[PDB]
Amino acid sequence: VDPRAKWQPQDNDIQACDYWRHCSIAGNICDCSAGSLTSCPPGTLVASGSWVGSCYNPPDPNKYITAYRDCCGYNVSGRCACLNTEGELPVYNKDANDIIWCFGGEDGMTYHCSISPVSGA
Amino acid sequence: VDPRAKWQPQDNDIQACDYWRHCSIAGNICDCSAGSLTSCPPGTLVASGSWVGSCYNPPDPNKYITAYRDCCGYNVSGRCACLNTEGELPVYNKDANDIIWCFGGEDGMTYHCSISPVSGA
Amino acid sequence: EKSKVAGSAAAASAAAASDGSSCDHGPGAISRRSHITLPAYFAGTTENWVSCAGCGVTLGHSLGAFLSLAVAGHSGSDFALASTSFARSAKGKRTDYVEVFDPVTFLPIADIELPDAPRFSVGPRVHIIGNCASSACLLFFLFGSSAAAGLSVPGASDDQLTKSASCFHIHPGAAATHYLGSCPASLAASDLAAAPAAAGIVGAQCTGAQNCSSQAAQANYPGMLVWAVASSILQGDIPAAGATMKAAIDGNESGRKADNFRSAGFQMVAKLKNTDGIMILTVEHSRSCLAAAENTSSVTASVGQTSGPISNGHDSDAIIAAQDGASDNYANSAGTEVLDIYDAASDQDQSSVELDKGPESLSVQNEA
Amino acid sequence: EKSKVAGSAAAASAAAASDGSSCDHGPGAISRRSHITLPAYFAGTTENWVSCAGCGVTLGHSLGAFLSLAVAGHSGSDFALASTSFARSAKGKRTDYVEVFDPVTFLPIADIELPDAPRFSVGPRVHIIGNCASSACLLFFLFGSSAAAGLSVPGASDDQLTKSASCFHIHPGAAATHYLGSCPASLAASDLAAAPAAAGIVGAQCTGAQNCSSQAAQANYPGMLVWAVASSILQGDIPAAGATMKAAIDGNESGRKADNFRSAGFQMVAKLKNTDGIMILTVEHSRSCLAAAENTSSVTASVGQTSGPISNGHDSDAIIAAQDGASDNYANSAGTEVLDIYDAASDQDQSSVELDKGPESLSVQNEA
Amino acid sequence: ATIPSESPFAAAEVADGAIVVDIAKMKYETPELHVKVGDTVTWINREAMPHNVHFVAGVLGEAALKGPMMKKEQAYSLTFTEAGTYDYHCTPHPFMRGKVVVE
Amino acid sequence: ATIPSESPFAAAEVADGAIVVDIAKMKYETPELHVKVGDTVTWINREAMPHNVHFVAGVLGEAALKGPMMKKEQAYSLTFTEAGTYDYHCTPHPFMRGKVVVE
Ligand SMILES: [Cu+2]
Ligand SMILES: [Cu+2]
């Protein structure tokens, strides 16, 4: 509600876009196309490449580094569509979300999905 | 409005699904993606194949045989989509509109568009 | 929404655990699994949804191309897809092919090409392409150039083009015999065995005036074909040995037909074999055959009696049912891009949003 | 809707005229012509809309694949696409290729393949792929494996992969020279001529604290690159001979800045060349850099003064302008899939619905 | 391609010599029909639904003449050189089909 | 592939002998560095951002070791046989690159 208002993280949905770990996703949520919050749907290929985001957790109030990995080798799921931009930074690399992070797979460069695993604090 | 109500012809729009000639279209209006009521859009191919429907002209009170030819070699335009069924008849041929009539082209078999040319009384 | 259970992760975090990513695997073919295909309004590309009824969760997805035909082996051993692609997708070289996936991992276990782009592109109908009872073959229909039945063998190979009469569906009776029935010369028996092709024709059911819907219901398990008309039901029981006609029953109760009641659009019929029930999409229509319908009447296949009520609450285009002991009725809305799941004894349970574009076909495996 | 001028049809019908179907052709390249690319939310397949301003008519369309980058020849001679296809689209063997269309017939006059699947898969920005001044070459950016600029010659063939530093966009200054500008180490000039590649680095503009948007506007005709920050405008004059920096200007009126104003999401900037005006999408933002804007401020590029207002009346993501004497401001909403066309002197004129999926790029020719 | 000759396309007058087949009920009348090499064959649309005459394409030379189209009357004539049996069909309905035998 | 050996993947203890392409400031510290054959250099994420060490794939045999990643210190060591000069990079940012000379 109201696209131009400060991100307001939550910790209870996961399928929704205001979900804490999703502070800088561009794409779609995997849980909505048979994956899980940190796992890819079947028949899909998991990348090595990723892009980071320092997301704040509302329950335990500390930020964590989320590594947004794509699952590739499929077409866009078209499911839980989201675009968040907490600290994104331009193409002059890596904090950058327009890039399709799919480096690693079968040869999977095709965007299907975005995973939201916690990689560190 | 009301999808289960007898089709009601008009002779004033053409990009509208209640235009007299469109009595048995399945797809999209050509006029809406660079074609014309009886001509194909550029880069697209004209089929020889087609399917007939006897349509009632509101102005002059006469029915005409409309030959619905497809414009192929492109992906659906996505525009003025319509599905009319005045006298359709099952797949046991020719009055039937689920079939992609595209026989004629480059080898064009992909549905882009349907034209609504009056081929006779 | 309850997948708001990501309170599972909150839990893991507190417990100081992992987040070790991997590709997961589908739960394993079963009775409540339902496949939703999306022809997507004639788009070059398309999608197929694998959902779990009960949960209402999508377990996976499959990608396909232009106007593909979906198949699912009843044993739950494989699911497949007949398909077409073009280089420079929409134009250029065309390629038709059969694709067969592992039902657990979703990985293509085979990719078989069809020789001369013989597919037959049409809004899909269950039954214009089918698996034979042994699941060693996949029969597919050719329209252009000449009417034909293509034989594909999953031993991975195009077998033969079985030339046939002016005839459309394909209802497999046996390993080597199928009813490419529905003709204007009503019902053909095709025997593709040994060396050749037989082709025997039935005693014409239905008259020139009775219009047979493009979407008939058939139980491969027990050769039961139920074929509604733009009004009511022609039933036939087929084995490798000729089809056998049953007495006609009208889905709509006379007064209703007077009052404009008529069959919907799309996957209008369904039949539960465990029982002998036919579900059918109706509402007050016209020449508006392909429209959505808001209701479903339940009838006894044996005794034309209406055992059932069924007001759907939504503009539904296609239906099917869980082929199990206590069946779920699947109501697919093309307009809303949602699958409404119901108790085959009225109530609405689930709903499964965003099966994007123009979802139109439900397929399930009949399994013990 | 006024194509209710299918009154011309009724008309022809009465004069007992014809209906002789044919493939027609576009009107011919002009200044009011606009291209609209549909990245489609990262779908494997995409579409380009060719439209006429004034008329507000779709003149044609073009087909493309995964995350293609459109380019349009200024003189109105060609249009083109860098694209990506897969066998079994989304999977299989990848093919990167450059296709070139005739502006009138829409048919492909050339189809050039890129060797090692080198393209660079990203949300598209005008400028990461560029035509050079003479139109005889197409420059494209390689990220993965090695940072590189590929060189394709339209005389139909891939030429050479020019090696570069950690550098982004491509803003060509000449036949043989481009500003593979914006690097971390601010501003690169590569001269690909003769045999080699030189590569000489500019005097660092901007600090690491100032963030340059992914979408700068640039006038090939007169080396005008204008690059807005997550707040305000850096300008550089590009010729052969090095870049030359101009004094920075702030698009927002100071009080606006505290009041929360900042540039939008997508193709935010546009620059009219005949004048020296900058168009900039803005609104009361935050870290919501990629979201839609309800407003547009016009500025004099020489004298950073605000000449203009602009309440668009809609949630717009991308803008541009007709490069002619009395210009139209194009306003593209990705969410509502409609292109709002206005007079670059306030008022909304036309409207273009259903450019379906999620449209994002506008490209116009800078025609005489 | 080869075998055989072209001539015209939709207009509708016989002439002296017969030689013809015309529409009626999705089917070429007198369908399987024999003729000598060099005899003309005029197809004439007799229907309220257009048609064409398109052999296939391994028969008649390379290519494969597709026949155009025609409503109320319109016609297409095809003349012939070599002997053999030629099979043709109406595309929009690959069903009405027929065969010529040039003897 | 060939050239050269594997060993382990993320864990993090040195040992005696040094030997370690390292990491931080996004860029394998002492990037261009020489070493003798029959070896094994340890890379290890010192960062607040994971990484990997991926060569290319026409250098080091067939394939082209990718290597993985994973902050937390985490380590990946690779040993060598043949002489020449290797050029590797961090995938998620093909930018910080390194080059090893086996002498
Ligand atoms: Cu015919
Ligand atoms: Cu790195």
Side-chain angles (χ1 to χ4, degrees), chain E residues 19 30-37 39 41 85 99-103:
Chain E
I19 290 266
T30 318
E32 163 149 310
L33 86 313
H34 319 347
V35 219
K36 49 151 162 183
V37 315
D39 283 303
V41 265
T85 152
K99 177 151 71 73
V100 197
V101 179
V102 186
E103 39 186 288

Short mmCIF file of all heavy atoms in Angstrom, two decimals, chain E residues 19 30-37 39 41 85 99-103:
data_model
loop_
_atom_site.label_atom_id
_atom_site.label_comp_id
_atom_site.label_asym_id
_atom_site.label_seq_id
_atom_site.Cartn_x
_atom_site.Cartn_y
_atom_site.Cartn_z
N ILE E 19 -14.88 -30.45 -69.27
CA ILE E 19 -13.76 -30.83 -68.45
C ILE E 19 -13.80 -30.11 -67.16
O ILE E 19 -13.28 -29.02 -66.90
CB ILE E 19 -12.52 -30.47 -69.16
CG1 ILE E 19 -12.33 -31.37 -70.38
CG2 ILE E 19 -11.49 -30.62 -68.09
CD1 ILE E 19 -11.46 -32.60 -70.14
N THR E 30 -17.57 -36.00 -59.18
CA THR E 30 -16.85 -36.97 -60.06
C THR E 30 -15.34 -37.04 -59.79
O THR E 30 -14.51 -36.98 -60.71
CB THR E 30 -17.18 -36.84 -61.58
OG1 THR E 30 -18.57 -36.62 -61.77
CG2 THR E 30 -16.79 -38.13 -62.31
N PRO E 31 -15.03 -37.00 -58.48
CA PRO E 31 -13.72 -36.91 -57.84
C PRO E 31 -12.56 -37.69 -58.45
O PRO E 31 -11.53 -37.08 -58.84
CB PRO E 31 -13.93 -37.50 -56.46
CG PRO E 31 -15.13 -38.44 -56.59
CD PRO E 31 -15.92 -37.96 -57.80
N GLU E 32 -12.65 -39.03 -58.37
CA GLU E 32 -11.66 -39.88 -59.03
C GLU E 32 -12.00 -39.83 -60.49
O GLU E 32 -13.05 -40.33 -60.88
CB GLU E 32 -11.63 -41.33 -58.55
CG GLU E 32 -10.87 -42.23 -59.55
CD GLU E 32 -10.16 -43.40 -58.91
OE1 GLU E 32 -9.43 -43.01 -57.91
OE2 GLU E 32 -10.09 -44.54 -59.38
N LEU E 33 -11.17 -39.16 -61.28
CA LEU E 33 -11.52 -39.04 -62.69
C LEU E 33 -10.30 -39.13 -63.57
O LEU E 33 -9.20 -38.74 -63.18
CB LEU E 33 -12.43 -37.83 -63.03
CG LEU E 33 -11.76 -36.49 -63.32
CD1 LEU E 33 -10.70 -36.14 -62.28
CD2 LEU E 33 -11.21 -36.38 -64.73
N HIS E 34 -10.48 -39.80 -64.72
CA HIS E 34 -9.39 -40.02 -65.65
C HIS E 34 -9.36 -39.06 -66.78
O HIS E 34 -10.41 -38.62 -67.25
CB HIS E 34 -9.41 -41.42 -66.26
CG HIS E 34 -9.76 -42.45 -65.26
ND1 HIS E 34 -9.77 -42.16 -63.91
CD2 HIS E 34 -9.85 -43.78 -65.41
CE1 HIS E 34 -10.03 -43.30 -63.30
NE2 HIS E 34 -10.03 -44.29 -64.18
N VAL E 35 -8.17 -38.80 -67.29
CA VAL E 35 -8.10 -37.88 -68.41
C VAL E 35 -6.82 -38.18 -69.19
O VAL E 35 -5.94 -38.88 -68.70
CB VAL E 35 -8.14 -36.42 -67.92
CG1 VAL E 35 -8.98 -35.59 -68.88
CG2 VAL E 35 -8.71 -36.23 -66.52
N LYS E 36 -6.75 -37.76 -70.45
CA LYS E 36 -5.51 -37.97 -71.21
C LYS E 36 -4.48 -36.89 -70.95
O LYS E 36 -4.82 -35.80 -70.47
CB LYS E 36 -5.68 -38.21 -72.69
CG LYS E 36 -6.59 -37.19 -73.34
CD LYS E 36 -6.27 -36.93 -74.80
CE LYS E 36 -7.43 -36.26 -75.52
NZ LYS E 36 -7.16 -36.05 -76.95
N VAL E 37 -3.23 -37.17 -71.26
CA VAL E 37 -2.25 -36.14 -71.00
C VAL E 37 -2.55 -34.96 -71.91
O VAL E 37 -2.83 -35.14 -73.09
CB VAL E 37 -0.83 -36.66 -71.12
CG1 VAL E 37 -0.73 -37.99 -70.40
CG2 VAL E 37 -0.38 -36.79 -72.56
N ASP E 39 -5.18 -32.90 -71.54
CA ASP E 39 -6.56 -32.47 -71.34
C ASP E 39 -6.57 -31.41 -70.24
O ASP E 39 -5.80 -31.52 -69.32
CB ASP E 39 -7.45 -33.58 -70.79
CG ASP E 39 -7.93 -34.65 -71.75
OD1 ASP E 39 -8.54 -34.43 -72.76
OD2 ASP E 39 -7.73 -35.85 -71.30
N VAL E 41 -8.50 -29.39 -67.12
CA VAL E 41 -9.41 -29.70 -66.03
C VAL E 41 -9.75 -28.41 -65.33
O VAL E 41 -8.89 -27.78 -64.71
CB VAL E 41 -8.91 -30.67 -64.95
CG1 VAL E 41 -9.35 -32.08 -65.23
CG2 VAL E 41 -7.40 -30.69 -64.89
N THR E 85 -0.97 -41.07 -61.44
CA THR E 85 -2.10 -40.67 -60.65
C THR E 85 -1.82 -39.64 -59.57
O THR E 85 -0.89 -39.81 -58.79
CB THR E 85 -3.29 -41.64 -60.58
OG1 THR E 85 -4.02 -41.49 -59.36
CG2 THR E 85 -2.83 -43.06 -60.86
N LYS E 99 -8.68 -37.59 -56.74
CA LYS E 99 -7.59 -38.16 -57.48
C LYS E 99 -7.86 -38.12 -58.97
O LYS E 99 -8.98 -38.26 -59.45
CB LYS E 99 -7.49 -39.62 -57.01
CG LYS E 99 -6.46 -40.48 -57.67
CD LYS E 99 -5.99 -41.55 -56.71
CE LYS E 99 -7.03 -42.61 -56.43
NZ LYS E 99 -7.22 -43.51 -57.57
N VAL E 100 -6.82 -37.76 -59.70
CA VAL E 100 -6.88 -37.72 -61.13
C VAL E 100 -5.94 -38.76 -61.62
O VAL E 100 -4.84 -38.83 -61.07
CB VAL E 100 -6.36 -36.41 -61.70
CG1 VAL E 100 -6.82 -36.25 -63.14
CG2 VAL E 100 -6.72 -35.20 -60.84
N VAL E 101 -6.29 -39.38 -62.75
CA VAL E 101 -5.46 -40.39 -63.37
C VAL E 101 -5.31 -40.00 -64.83
O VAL E 101 -6.32 -39.89 -65.54
CB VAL E 101 -6.12 -41.77 -63.22
CG1 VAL E 101 -5.28 -42.86 -63.89
CG2 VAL E 101 -6.31 -42.09 -61.74
N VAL E 102 -4.07 -39.59 -65.20
CA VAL E 102 -3.69 -39.13 -66.54
C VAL E 102 -3.12 -40.31 -67.34
O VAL E 102 -2.00 -40.77 -67.07
CB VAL E 102 -2.67 -38.00 -66.46
CG1 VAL E 102 -2.39 -37.43 -67.85
CG2 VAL E 102 -3.19 -36.92 -65.53
N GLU E 103 -3.92 -40.80 -68.27
CA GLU E 103 -3.63 -42.01 -69.01
C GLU E 103 -3.19 -41.95 -70.47
O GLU E 103 -3.30 -40.87 -71.09
CB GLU E 103 -4.61 -43.14 -68.65
CG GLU E 103 -6.04 -42.62 -68.46
CD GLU E 103 -7.00 -43.66 -67.96
OE1 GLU E 103 -7.32 -44.57 -68.85
OE2 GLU E 103 -7.48 -43.62 -66.85
#
